[PDB]
């Protein structure tokens, strides 16, 4: 666990981080100037106080500031105050405290949200950001539960509503949404959410996610003491940090020390033994979680020819590849009889090779069966036919054939028993296996099979403030400033919130006998949502059955397990689009093409309409 | 055997060298091979004799009967002896003073010297006895594609490189070298057999042409081959064809006069070396990279 | 130590190759990827359908050696600029293949011959490769340092060469690179492989790749002298070469074969070893700048700016200016009030533009070595460095010091001074606005009172650096004029660059300005000999100041203060680089410009050509006051 | 690629002089084709490929009767919206005489092989159209021993110096593209205000039909124009030669100007920085023809007195639509 140590009083800067450090802790959150030291600006006499008007620079190395206190805002400081004065005065100290802090090259500067209207604060706090555009990163305080709506019922004439109010009790996210708005997405700009003693509904909790938290602050007031006076949290606490845990968000404890047997220590450990004692890290799981969150282009291993690393994630993927045999063996059993087995030998060409683990696949299978097979190994990308002829010369031998061309060109010298594909994207069709398998079928026997025989494509709506951040920063020079919102990634996703059950798009079957062959599709898609949220794309997945039972995932349902050969796809829109509760959001999508392009274009419809994505391919073709 | 069959030259008593090289696959290398049947070739269990050389070979020339000296791409000059029974091949010497691809190699008319060429852009003098190199000539700027000894005299041989100079040489003069429009680049020269005054020479266009070094004119020249002119040959004959080797993978043999008598596209591949049969006058023996070992009946 | 790499055009097993060339001590390897003698057929049959496998697998490597360790190579029977017809088409898809799959393999490097003067189709062909794919691929240019024809020996009879003079001619080579890197339209992508021969030519020669992204040198075995002992050396003058290419810090490559083949390749590479520990050690300002070698910055506005607090630290981390600053108040110190006086007359002495006070450290321990009486203040506007003045002086100074948190142009001071130190230098002397703030400062200054510093002046020299204006070049930013990069300074280290003439003085000030028409606007025009062939791609500016009669202060090359490292040079870049011939002569003008605002420079160069007026109404780069 | 508007083809047609040439040279083709006696008995196979509103098939009409020989007319054009035209000209006025078809001529499978194919396809510098790739797609049902007119086409080069039109095209820089993209295209231009500094020379060459069995549309040349005055080079004037048939040809190159025919306009290759060039200095200009399954596109680039860069490289800012 990465960690931090809140204190509103630091006697002395150096014994305080000296002591915070033998605690075990990586970081202090302290205030920069004192935190009573109300300052005067406009009126005299007050005006002219004598300085210092705070503690030297001095006191650390450069290094200790950059790497080990995060500011704080003074609570004296209100520039939402209804009284104009206080306004003018805390603009004044906001400036000043903040441009502290970043004299001093602090990592983090935290600010407070703490009630409905902070649009001051935010207009104060987006001038300065345009005021040298430096590293420094910003982390609002904002309660899980707004402190009003956690006060102890014991008010006479006040009583708390015992009643249900869905909307009201997500209100501190709300506070954040608008701030976060107001300051135009700065990505400079974060969440340090606060959790209290009451947890609220899932559904409170869940307004979150999908939100840049980059720190999880706990108090001491919500820790429980157990039979030897140690500090520990309920079962629903633990939950949460464990929630917490996977987006890796710093830990920040505040609050005096109420459990005084021990040292602050405790608290701290009783997190690092959670966090060691949760299922160890995968080797599946660890080479994922580099990639959390992170954009990549579409590969288009039709137009592009692939790299070879590329080709070496791909075959270093076992699961697949034991699917892919298991699928031609029962294909060859139920092609061939027992008693045929030496007098029938099946033509079975694997159509986009790569370097050839579905040529090992296939003999593997050819032998697993017992059964006979001549071999054809298709590729256009010449440098990994050259990978292709070694093996061959090498191991296959004459069994197996090197063709180096593409399917949709190649004059075949004999009909196929089987076609073997690989040529499927995240979103299954976005490498165009529909056109490329269109092609190489007329060399298939009147009776033969593809494998895959069938694949499909699925969608839903996801919120992700991150996200769709990641996505607005992806705007370059020389092309269209929204360009990078009419385009999809592939990405390992992480922190977002699914908001609807994926459904099905697009579909393609293999062999199409259809004398009027159409690869372009129009779908609709309607996704019931049943929370509150902000609608920022779409996730895509796919399935494929290769043979009869045998089938591929990376649909969260139906996920091959253990299967890290694709990641998801990200459609995502221009504007985001609130969804209330019980709304329905109503998507539309179309694959288009010409003789030259295949492309996507999509739009949401319901609750609200956005603007049709990808028009003309204009951001985004795939080639042919 | 590797697949590309480098160099095929023919013995006195009618037994056939070859030189083959590995240009693909794994290992990038070389091999001797000694064939007292000729038509037992290139089959390897048919031989008389084989070795195996560290990396390929780029050219190769006989040393009267026992020696074999042989152009290496690991910028050294091998000189492999032959066995007392002429059933191993053995390595007398080999030499890294060349700092590039040895490309062409031709044995002087004392039999004792021998004159190298490389991709360094160097030519190299080498008494094969004392095993050193007596004379190291920087007269080229681009890298040296053929080298030919002159057939009756021992100081003097023709070079040409991709600096598009034909230079003939004299080690007696203090300035051996001596240069004779500029056409297309110069790939493959041939003394002619009986009168030490003129020669040919291919180029990269597929044009041979007949020089005489004392008319220093070209006399005449031919179309031959749609692609570069990778070797030329003359035969052993009284009144002596010319083969002419080229990338376009066809045979061509020609008159005295330059016109086509005989063409075969047998190869399907480059044609690398041709060697005339000195027991059948009228039978011509060709290689290329298609492993094929070709045996051409001439009228 | 050294960087290094072997090149060979032999490889028969990769992977005992590899280790052989490990184990001798190099860190990587140039090689070919095809089988350079193996020609490929792509337009006519029968030989077209060749069946392969072409060359050997990518499985023999890992993915971490591929991207490592191996350079490729351009087979050489590719002639993409071949006169025939034929050729030229058939080296133009083997290009592409070679290309394409060292880009399969991802190799760091891949390396290619220019051996003639026109490369224009190779050029075409891998200006269309690098625009599919923006890859990291680095691509080295093998470039002789001398022509294989003006290196040959003179043994052709019909043919001699001249031992004349050819100034031009003989810097050939450069121009074949200039050529190709100019129609590849500045391809960072696109590097310089100088190769190293036997004789070496003039020193001018040598000088035109001054400011060329030279990446690698190449030395062969031939060039290497045997000494005594049998072990491989050079001369005198390639060791000199040799130092040059060090501080460029280039990767060295071996070629050619084991000539002195007593030893072992590790000794040519020991001998290199060698020379770069037996290299002079490097000086505390060396250790600095190298990190900030050709690394550009923004030139900071503390006028404007408020600096953070180590950008100070830096600032301060610099002894032998602040004793230079000492040193002069000392001196004026004693000029000022005479010895039996000491005790009688105090002096003021107001430091303006104090920062974190080290100035005010000095003006103390001058006093106290000069033995007089001062009051000080410490004038600063940036309140951020008031809060550790006002600290210091609570805690240290007491009230002999004064911290005044403000600005010079604002301040009513109390009393009039004796004395006003300053430190609002920039690398150009006035581009931090020091004459408008002095000028401001100055009314409460006594009409007889000196200022530390009393004079500055800026510098000028035209350079050649490809590598800097290639730098410069991808500075474009979105939502702005795409040139605006070219009309603005940076500071910089200048390392890797080309200085074409002797600086010149360009703008002076003087400190108090009597004058009673104060203009602190400047056209000056500079005229700069040249005496060499090069292309002019920016301007370096230095400064120097005198702080008191002989106490002065300089980062100009010919009179730096030495051990100094607190400014670096100032660039000023032109758009479109400008060829100029061995005799003519530079002629630039510059203008300092203001406004009730701003201050800004704009400039042009008005021969041996004209240029475009840079920064014109500081619309790319204004100074704020 | 695009589908031309209607008033285009209007300016087209309205061009006498090219279409009195035309039919001249389609008679000329057909006295030498069918002799005297046979004149009645061989009736010619003649497809007019980029047939547009249909002024070439007026003109093959004309032709057939000042000739007097026997014709069966095709009319090609993958264009539709003038198909409508040319469908209600064949109903109205041609009868079954003509075949209007409405397709690519690199499509098209036609019933029975042509003796002469008549084409249009050519653009102010001759090939930038396309005519080579669609007349080798049209070629295999031409007969073999067929004519195509045209038969040949080149395209001419000249350097320019003007200062004014540089200027013009400088301030074709949009936003959302490369600020330079707009030198590394070319225009359509009346030239006017503008300095010839060297004669023009053939840059590409194209023969049709083109038996050849290894075709290759693609082209490098290199031109070098003496020039005998001091100057700034900002770009080349484009302009085209054509033969028809033999001794009818067409020019707009401004020495062999077909005189009165305003149907195209020069072409203009500029360059990003201008050159200066002193009196004697020759300029060395490269010249690309590129192509791909796809798109076919120039790539051009100044090597003296003074090197450039290569403009429109990989077809970045300009591509030819196939
Ligand atoms: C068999 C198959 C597999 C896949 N799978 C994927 O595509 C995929 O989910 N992932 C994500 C993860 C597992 C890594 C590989 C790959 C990927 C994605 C996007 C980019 S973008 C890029 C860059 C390309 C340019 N070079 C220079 C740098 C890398 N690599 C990649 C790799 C798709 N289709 C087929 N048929
Ligand atoms: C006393 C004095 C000194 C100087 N000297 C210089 O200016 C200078 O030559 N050098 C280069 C070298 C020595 C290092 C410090 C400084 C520098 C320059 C340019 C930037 S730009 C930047 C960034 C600012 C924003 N933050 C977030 C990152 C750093 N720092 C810097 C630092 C000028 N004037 C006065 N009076
Ligand atoms: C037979 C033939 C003729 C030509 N000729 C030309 O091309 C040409 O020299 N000229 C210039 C002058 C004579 C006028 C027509 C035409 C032209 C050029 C460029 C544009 S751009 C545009 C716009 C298109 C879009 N709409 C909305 C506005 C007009 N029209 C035009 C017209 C080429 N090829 C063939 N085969
Ligand atoms: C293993 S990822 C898909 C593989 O199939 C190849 N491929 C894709 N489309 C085709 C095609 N139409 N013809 C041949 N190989 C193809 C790709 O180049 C890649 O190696
Ligand atoms: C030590 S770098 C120059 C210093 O002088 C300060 N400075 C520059 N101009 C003024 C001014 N007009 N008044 C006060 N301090 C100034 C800057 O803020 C910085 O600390
Ligand atoms: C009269 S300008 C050229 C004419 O030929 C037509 N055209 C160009 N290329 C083709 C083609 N491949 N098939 C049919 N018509 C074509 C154009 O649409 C236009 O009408």
Redesign the interface.
Known sequence: VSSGRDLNCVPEIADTLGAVAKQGFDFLCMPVFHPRFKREFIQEPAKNRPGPQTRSDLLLSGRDWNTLIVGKLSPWIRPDSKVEKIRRNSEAAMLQELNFGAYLGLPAFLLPLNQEDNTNLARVLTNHIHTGHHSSMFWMRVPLVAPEDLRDDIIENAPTTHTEEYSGEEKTWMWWHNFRTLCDYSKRIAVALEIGADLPSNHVIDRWLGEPIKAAILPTSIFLTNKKGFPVLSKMHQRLIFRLLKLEVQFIITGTNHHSEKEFCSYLQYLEYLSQNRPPPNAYELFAKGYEDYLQSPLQPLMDNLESQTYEVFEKDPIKYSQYQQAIYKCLLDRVPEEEKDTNVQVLMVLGAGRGPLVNASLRAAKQADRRIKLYAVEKNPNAVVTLE?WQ?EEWGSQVTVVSSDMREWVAPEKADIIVSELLGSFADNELSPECLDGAQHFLKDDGVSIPGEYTSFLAPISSSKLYNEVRACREKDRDPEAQFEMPYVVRLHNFHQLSAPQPCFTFSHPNRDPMIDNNRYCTLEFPVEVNTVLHGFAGYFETVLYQDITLSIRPETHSPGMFSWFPILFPIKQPITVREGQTICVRFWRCSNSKKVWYEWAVTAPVCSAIHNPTGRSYTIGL | MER?LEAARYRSDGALLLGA?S???????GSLWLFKDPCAAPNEGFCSAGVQT???V?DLTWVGERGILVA?????VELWELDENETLIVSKFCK??????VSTVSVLSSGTQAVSGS???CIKVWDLAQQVVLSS???????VTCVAASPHKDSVFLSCSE?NRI?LWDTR???????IAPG?LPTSLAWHPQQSEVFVFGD??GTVSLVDTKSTSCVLSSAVH???VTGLVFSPHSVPFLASLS???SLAVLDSSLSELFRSQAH???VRDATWSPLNHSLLTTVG?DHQVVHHVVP
Do not use: M, T, V
């Open positions: 070694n010369f | 590309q090289s240009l693909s696959g794994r290992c990038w290398a560290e990396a390929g780029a290496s791409d690991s910028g050294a890294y003073e060349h700092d590039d691809i991709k360094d852009i000539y920087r007269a080229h700027a681009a890298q600096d230079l003069c203090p300035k051996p070298a001596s240069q297309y990269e266009n749609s692609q570069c990338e376009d993978c399907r591949d480059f990279w």
